Amino acid sequence: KVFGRCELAAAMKRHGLDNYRGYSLGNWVCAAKFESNFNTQATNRNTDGSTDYGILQINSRWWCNDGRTPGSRNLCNIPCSALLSSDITASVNCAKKIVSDGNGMNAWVAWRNRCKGTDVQAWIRGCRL
Ligand SMILES: [Cl-]
Ligand SMILES: [Cl-]
Ligand SMILES: [Cl-]
Ligand SMILES: [Cl-]
Ligand SMILES: [Cl-]
Ligand SMILES: [Cl-]
Ligand SMILES: [Cl-]
Ligand code: NA
């Protein structure tokens, strides 16, 4: 599923992401935009052989099992395929663990490079939340 901007903001808020670990809703929408272009089905291979999955491009190196990332962990305790659903619940629950892991939203490279320090409120502007 390809989410609309406000549609995803609302779903994220409903799943508890708004101000989660101090990160306003716009930060999450911005991260999703640049990670997956709001596409729940997005997958991308990394050079180390891991794969990024879903709306928030969660990495099989640490967070989910895809059975093809040697030596990797599965800290969210889920198959990576569960991160590709039209329902964002699994991605959001895993994201909560990731953003609590120590480096905050810097874990998402696109967030750090494209969202961090910017006017992220613009991502929820106009949205009926
Ligand atoms: Cl957009
Ligand atoms: Cl918020
Ligand atoms: Cl915001
Ligand atoms: Cl594996
Ligand atoms: Cl594990
Ligand atoms: Cl959803
Ligand atoms: Cl933080
Ligand atoms: Na893994």
UniProtKB/Swiss-Prot annotation:
Q: Please list the residues that bind substrate.
A: D101
List the active site: E35, D52
Q: Does the keyword Hydrolase apply?
A: yes
Q: Which UniProt keywords apply?
A: Allergen, Antimicrobial, Bacteriolytic enzyme, Disulfide bond, Glycosidase, Hydrolase, Secreted, Signal
Disulphide bonds annotated for this chain are: C6-C127, C30-C115, C64-C80, C76-C94
User: Where do the C-type lysozyme domain residues begin and end?
Assistant: 1-129
Among the GO biological process terms of this entry, one is: defense response to Gram-negative bacterium
Q: What is the reaction catalyzed?
A: Hydrolysis of (1->4)-beta-linkages between N-acetylmuramic acid and N-acetyl-D-glucosamine residues in a peptidoglycan and between N-acetyl-D-glucosamine residues in chitodextrins
Supply the PROSITE patterns for this chain.
GLYCOSYL_HYDROL_F22_1, GLYCOSYL_HYDROL_F22_2
Which EC number(s) are documented for this chain? Answer: 3.2.1.17
CDD domains attached to this UniProt entry:
LYZ_C (cd16897)
Which GO molecular function annotation, any one, does this entry have? Answer: lysozyme activity
Q: Which InterPro entries match?
A: Glyco_hydro_22 (IPR001916), Glyco_hydro_22_CS (IPR019799), Glyco_hydro_22_lys (IPR000974), Lysozyme-like_dom_sf (IPR023346)
Recorded GO cellular component terms are: cytoplasm; endoplasmic reticulum; extracellular space
> Any idea where this protein resides?
Secreted
| Tissue spec | In the egg white and polymorphonuclear leukocytes.
- Look up the further comments and give them: Lysozyme C is capable of both hydrolysis and transglycosylation; it also shows a slight esterase activity. It acts rapidly on both peptide-substituted and unsubstituted peptidoglycan, and slowly on chitin oligosaccharides.
Family membership noted in the UniProt record:
Belongs to the glycosyl hydrolase 22 family.
Its function?
A: Lysozymes have primarily a bacteriolytic function; those in tissues and body fluids are associated with the monocyte-macrophage system and enhance the activity of immunoagents. Has bacteriolytic activity against M.luteus.
**Assembly notes:** Monomer.
Give the protein name, as stated in the record. Answer: Lysozyme C
Please name the source species. Answer: Gallus gallus (Chicken)
Q: What is the lineage of its organism?
A: Eukaryota, Metazoa, Chordata, Craniata, Vertebrata
Gene expressing this chain: LYZ
